[PDB]
């Protein structure tokens, strides 16, 4: 019996009008029916980038601008990338120390796998980008 129940997602209800259900204005949406206001599409600016465009029935989602990667749940914040073989410290991206490596454009350097301590031999030496490849005997 509620006249606003006839207004589905993508529209909003306002009984002061001839047409009870009105489309949500551009850059706004409603993810459920019966709303009497439209949610404004969220912004992806600064370090953020619009991953999924907002529609009349769904909000926009933000990933990070190129050169940055997501951190936290739902890409809450962004963190600057570094090249492979580097590490983001308090003094910027720095090359890994000799004996460590980083194979990703994020994270910290990690020590090379010590093949001797595991009873194996070195098949391929280590690199700032790549871990040591161990081999049997």
């Amino acid at each position, epitope marked *: 019996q509620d006249p*606003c129940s006839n207004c589905p997602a993508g529209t*909003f*209800c*306002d009984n*002061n009008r001839n047409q009870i259900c009105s489309p*949500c*204005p551009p850059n*706004s*949406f*409603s*993810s*459920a029916g*019966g*709303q*009497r*206001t*439209c*949610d*404004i599409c*969220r*912004q992806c600016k600064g370090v953020f980038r619009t991953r999924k465009e907002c529609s009349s029935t769904s*909000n926009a989602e933000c990933d990070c601008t190129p050169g940055f990667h997501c951190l936290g749940a739902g890409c809450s914040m962004c963190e600057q990338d570094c090249k492979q073989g580097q590490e983001l410290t308090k003094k910027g991206c720095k090359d890994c120390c000799f004996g460590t490596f980083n194979d990703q454009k994020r994270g910290i350097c990690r020590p090379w796998t010590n093949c001797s301590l595991d009873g194996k031999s070195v098949l391929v030496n280590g690199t700032k980008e790549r871990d040591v490849v161990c081999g049997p005997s």
Partner: antibody
Amino acid sequence: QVQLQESGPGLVKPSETLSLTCTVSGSSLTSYGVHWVRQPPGKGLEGLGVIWPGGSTNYNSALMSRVTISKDNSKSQVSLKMSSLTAADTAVYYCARVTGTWYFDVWGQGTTVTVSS
Amino acid sequence: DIQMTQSPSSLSASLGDRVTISCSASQGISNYLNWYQQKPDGTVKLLIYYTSTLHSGVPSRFSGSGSGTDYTLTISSLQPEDIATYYCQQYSKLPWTFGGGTKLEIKR
């Protein structure tokens, strides 16, 4: 009938977490937005943020991301949290109902917050 | 943010006078402006939305007009209960910003 009422502590020291509550009477939060506004003494109305029926929020940049707004639809409550309070955050805080696209058609009476040791 | 300025900051008018308060935006807001009334005890209510649409229950002596960057709120016949501060509010761009408000007092 439709009514909004703010609530929360009136005195907060500069160990700086402020928490307020906006209770709505005749307006479902899944159908309406809720906007927080504050008026410093001898000043005008200053909006703080809005939480939409879908749960997403938008905040004023001047608040330096110290303001967080959440809600519980089943309890008909909208929560306002603010950190890093200065004496500049002393004001009376309003919550208003966002209707149409867009206007504040229902206002609460306001709650006074004083930041002092 | 969009800057909202109201002229004058304070006004005193006789009863039955026609009152007009101005509200100007730093940029065009495409008639996305609301008017609010704050009574001296702190009560705030909506007067007009979309710059000319009277909210339900507001007396018919309130009216708004304007376009572009310049908008006004008109009281056709000033009444004793109209003693209040009046704020304009734009919703063209987030964050929504209020004007500085015009304080209205009544001569007698």
